[model samples]
Target: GSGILEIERLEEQLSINVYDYNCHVDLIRLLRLEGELTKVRMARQKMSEIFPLTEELWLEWLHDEISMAQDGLDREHVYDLFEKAVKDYICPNIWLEYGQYSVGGIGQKGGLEKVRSVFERALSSVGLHMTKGLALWEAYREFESAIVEAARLEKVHSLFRRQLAIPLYDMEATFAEYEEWSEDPIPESVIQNYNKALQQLEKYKPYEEALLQAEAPRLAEYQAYIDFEMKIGDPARIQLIFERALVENCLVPDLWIRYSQYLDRQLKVKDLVLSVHNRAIRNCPWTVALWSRYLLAMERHGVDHQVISVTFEKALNAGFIQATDYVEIWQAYLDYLRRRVDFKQDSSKELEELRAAFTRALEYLKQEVEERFNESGDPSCVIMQNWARIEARLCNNMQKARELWDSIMTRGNAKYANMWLEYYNLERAHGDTQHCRKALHRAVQCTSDYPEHVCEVLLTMERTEGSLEDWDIAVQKTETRLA
Candidate 1:
């Protein structure tokens, strides 16, 4: 295939320009696109041999390989990958992934021992990551749970006891989880650890109180106070700390988001989560993500449609910082609307309401949102695409769906490979083969970013549905453009 040739060229370029980091990255990306797993692995190994891959790139490569591994045959390979990954960075997340992967390899001989060794190493390396170290400790304890029969309870108990002595966020939860697991009575040693942690909290109480009493934007002190309480791991106390922080730092969008997230995840009490979300939007109405998350929480809790509608209206008026925020908020609302409708039914009030909402959302974003933000939030017209999909798949209104897609392409979305591929898939799924061919042709011409991706899609489509002549035409077109 053309991709093989392209990947070969990239490899030759890398051979000559061995130090070109971008060329190495490009080769890796191309190899992945071609689904050449062995080649991709070799490319990653070569790159890391020359220079350290960034944390993000290492994660991408490690996760890709981890998912591909099965049974004991590749277990050592994955283990080696994790070892290399952790040495490059002191990331708690990487250590946690390593520990978890090692635990999964426990079926192999010496697997349990390997698991414990990795967890111990992770703790030694990143046990003091402050806010994130707790995760490593939790993973360690979880691994012990899997081998509880063969495990020494005293060793596990001592680990918890020792961890409790460390001043880390959310240790209270750890302590609680530990107490629930242990059969032994609360040992004096463990009690002393709790006392020490509590004393640390007491040391930070003055700062907490100072934050509570402070005026607006006492951000630094409030953060410190929140960090202290979070480490203590008392939900009630943490909630109180967040409330105190928000009272003074209401204008801080991040503070509002964090407070809302904490309440949503930890408290999960409907009224409490709802109240904090409401207060968050009221305090920082301009923050689009807060509004999006609030809407998601409401949908998750199955709040009334009218409540969601009213809140969505308020979000539109909330005044976002970026145009894309408006697009995202609208997408969230539309997703909520789509979930409410039953596609099995031929016609329903919910379906009609979804259509109307889509129509109204487009107009609202184009008019009011654009007028406020000075540009369309949805330059890609993603909402229109969603509307078209619902029309085709749910309503069976191919005519309307095609119309909507036509509008999406006209709105500067045609140049994007993702957008073209999205439309092409919709047509391939619900419409005729002719429409799919037409969309792919336009995509080949219009797609600028990742043109190779679009070209591959076109070739794949031709292989599936085209005649030999059609296949020849597709190959010629892609070769000419890629050349």
Candidate 2:
């Protein structure tokens, strides 16, 4: 209506109905644009009288209504409208979406009821109709959460058979055998399905039980073994975890990371870290992050020094980036030579051989960097960081390490603090106490700029003093500094 006159003229009509998508759209648009939100409610009432079975019309109206409500941050009416829509048509996707929005807020919230409704509806309406084996398995997985424990177990049993019938069937048979051995009642259907699934569990019955018992101790002792091994820096402990866990629960990347963390923290043999990373890669071959970690670990551990150039050449020829870090690999070769001298008497021939090894390592590293650049569209910054680390350790040249770190910072667009702190640590390692102190002072200054960081840094500094008097003095000095 143009004005009150237009509205009065429209009201004079005894038989009036507003119908059609365009009319509804125009009305919603006018209501929203004119800030006549109350009129939107009146408009919706008029629509119900005119177009009763208008799902699409209702959707369009809800879209505008929800947008306006959100813009005003009016939670009460927003939730009311959403709930009403669900009552009319319980769309699981829409329910999940609404539930996600309500999760962390206070006003008139939904909880387990909404979760259960959406999950049950999704399972009953959509999941049960699925035909593909993978889809059915996924459906069973979703149903496991909606159903009770007994139903969940049954779903697992069914999904297990659907996915890996041979192995799971054998497992089921073993369960039946054990049930029989315990004089428990056996379901005839279960036994029948077990035989149909696989014969291996029955054929190797006693041995399987024996192995399970023997291996049970390994799993039981895993926590203690991992604790002791990681604490004492034992690679053999890492080895045990990998082997035992692999035997029991195959290709679990999370557990693999636990084992890798120990080796990585200690900055120990890259080969062991590489081994675990490779195992994860084997499981999830498409995982770029795991492969990246593998490459970094390789650079850290000086794999080029450990293995010959010909070996790396073979790997490269097999279409992998082998030689990569020119500066770092050559540096590791030098360190390896020096380390060898400490363990074995130096000789002319040995020195020549060491020189040759260094040459090959550098060649491999340079080539690897080029290949990686070609594949990834840039040289790998993570690998470069590891390259810097190896250079610091093997070359014992802090300046070169600093340059590599700077290069990484420039290439990676990495934040300053973490890399800066690392560079500071490297300087400290090389007896550059003056640089270390200055860097520490700068870091402290930067930290003090924020109150939370100031508290953390001061606490850390106090803790480092390790004595009551020192701690007291530190606290006093910190307060004075802040002042």
Candidate 3:
């Protein structure tokens, strides 16, 4: 109802505390709603700098930046902006539209080269994945390109020997084909291996016969197949065998996890690792471990932050079995953001970006999480607790640190002395002794869990660092604030 006044009020709030994530999002929200734009982008970037933005925000960023660009170099400028957006997500669909936009731009400017760069990155980031990448491939290929196949000459030579070597349903079949391809006498190389291969067929034929019936998923039959395939140690056979099992048993997490882990460890084939891992998540998207490892596998294989972040976002929407799994996944991403920031130097995004994500995590959990799960899921308010410590530890900003501590306890955390002690201890070391005394007294009143521990901490802290009457008064006036 009161639009600009709310905008004015939020503007004042953000000016005072640029660190408040909610106020920034609110200001962006209000201004965006008001049919206003650029000021909100400054506001948007503040939120953007700290968290993964929603697609809507990034799209707005593009729309405004494109139409409003005054200088001709806004062309160069928006190309850069496109990069920022691309890095922000592995959104095949977002990039799908982005490629079209690049194509749109290309026609006017004749910038086939510039647009090619766009598709190239788009391919690496989302094309390598999505279980949705093929659309992007067609999107790009529909634009322009070529294709080719690979080869080998020892291939025909090795093809004959290698074909002779594998114990498929086909020694005789391949023997006839290979002899024709050779159109010559059996070289001892082909003849001897063909002989050894026949022996393999008889040995393996027991399980090949076992495969004759047992209907669909056939886990038992496949289990025997994979078991022998693993023992045989033929990468190609094992590879085909696992895929054969998976084609039917795609819903089985254990089988997918096993296939992925085998590929991860034995294959070191980064390309193959990603394909199966991506498939693993799609088939059993509800499993946390599959999502978790697929993320790590993607990351360990040097998938870019843009792609990795996109996969993580996809994981979040993937419908985990329990609420707490969100905590674990967010924690994994938070830790990655933390490691990305270099503590020693003051750079813009990464350090504060970590804090922004931390703050956004609280907002995400507090709002959307409760909507989805009907609970906050993190009763410890662990996200905020860790955030407060970083504010305390990294920046040494006790003001913001104390604010989060204050915020944490009010969310039903007032009863836990462990939380109180942590807030107290952080204050004791980095903040005023007066707040220490203040916190100790509050703990005595509101703390219900391990009540005496705060009592012990208060006296011990006071002895090392102050007085007696304050402690006595603390115990007597034990009611959050007895004043």
Candidate 4:
């Protein structure tokens, strides 16, 4: 209703110099938003008559109608309208979207041939012949035409690259200027800031044709470096990218992961990882995986671990600490302490006090896990296993361990040879020879499927067996079975 009213107002209020092209574009957008389909179609038809050569308008109409088709709103009429519009104008993005949509919608009703037809038509269309030319150039070794087509491709690519790069350059420049202003030995600070800016700039800098031509071999090296940087867990590369690359290119979560991993691996810098994680959190603070990885990195690198531990509390306070993240942080903290030989083998005479610390920390973790499990109604396998192991080691509590093992076993028909081995260890310690043998049998049964696990089971069996002949039989059986 408002869309039609706005169109009427525009007709009366606007000057004749103001092309219906602009007004109709606005009108169509508004009508689509208002769900006034009939009026939108009529306006599109009117605009087509006025501006027959306008490719963008027809592309927009087709895109909108296709999106509606996906929702099963209006199919036949919309399809007819969109088909007729495509006859008049074909845009590469529209064809790409249609191709993708049709490919995805293949199993629904129409086969992917429909999308293929649209793609073929798009390739043949005016202004889009270059897309086909580029494809042919790349695939068929049509170097002469390909080189000419490269100019056209470069036009589009440059526009896209600029859209990506300028913002990053601006931000890097701004940050460098800020850093220079903040900590001024002026010249030294400026140089440092400029170098940081240069790194940021270099990271996001798209492969230029001139540069690529001058240094063809180095292009591959540069790409490899970027890929390597992306794998770092420390996140420095991503920070550089965000400061520079994001300006020119797209910023994706996976890309952030690569940057984080690069910092983590190459620089061995948790600070960068922390920055990457924090930036990721800023983008999607509710992402459990991101937060867990962040907490884990902080703990391992000893990057203000106490502060990070307290930060999770703040996350809880702010209602940002999701159940999964909370449990993961707690488990990571325990892993940090437990895996440390020095921490576990402390020379504290006050055994009860040490036990109290373990008990309190374990209780806190268990409570967090229970809350999460209750909320989501899905038990965490990792938390359960970790908690079971902790109790077995710290409290020497076999019952708790057994309960965890049974719980895991009952849920799935899948075999857990690792749990079986742990159970065998507990049974042997308690002098339950029969139960220990049964556990080993279960482990051995699954070991044929997992050879490494079979070796562990066989070794454990030999240790429990009293006679040398029994040990010999067990070892030989394991070796023969593996072979």
Best by lDDT: 1
Give the Å shift of residue 239 in candidate 4: 6.0
Query: In model 4, which regions exceed 4 Å deviation?
Result: 1-242, 247-251, 268-273, 314-330, 337-380, 391-400, 403-418, 425-434, 438-483
lDDT of 2 by residue, 278-321 (tens): 55544433334444455556556666744434323323333322
Per-residue CA lDDT of model 1 for 165-241, tens digit only, reads 87667778878877897887768776887888767756765784575587656788888878877887877657756
Identify the leading candidate in terms of TM-score.
3
TM-score of each: 0.55, 0.27, 0.57, 0.39
Tens-digit lDDT track of model 3 for 184-233: 57787668777876787787677756766677778989889899989989
Worst 10 residues of 4 by lDDT: 136-145
Error of 3 at 288 (Å): 4.5
Minimum summed lDDT over a 10-residue window in model 3 is located at 145-154
RMSD to native, candidate 2: 24.1
Better of 2 and 3 by TM-score: 3
- Stronger candidate by TM-score (1 vs 3): 3
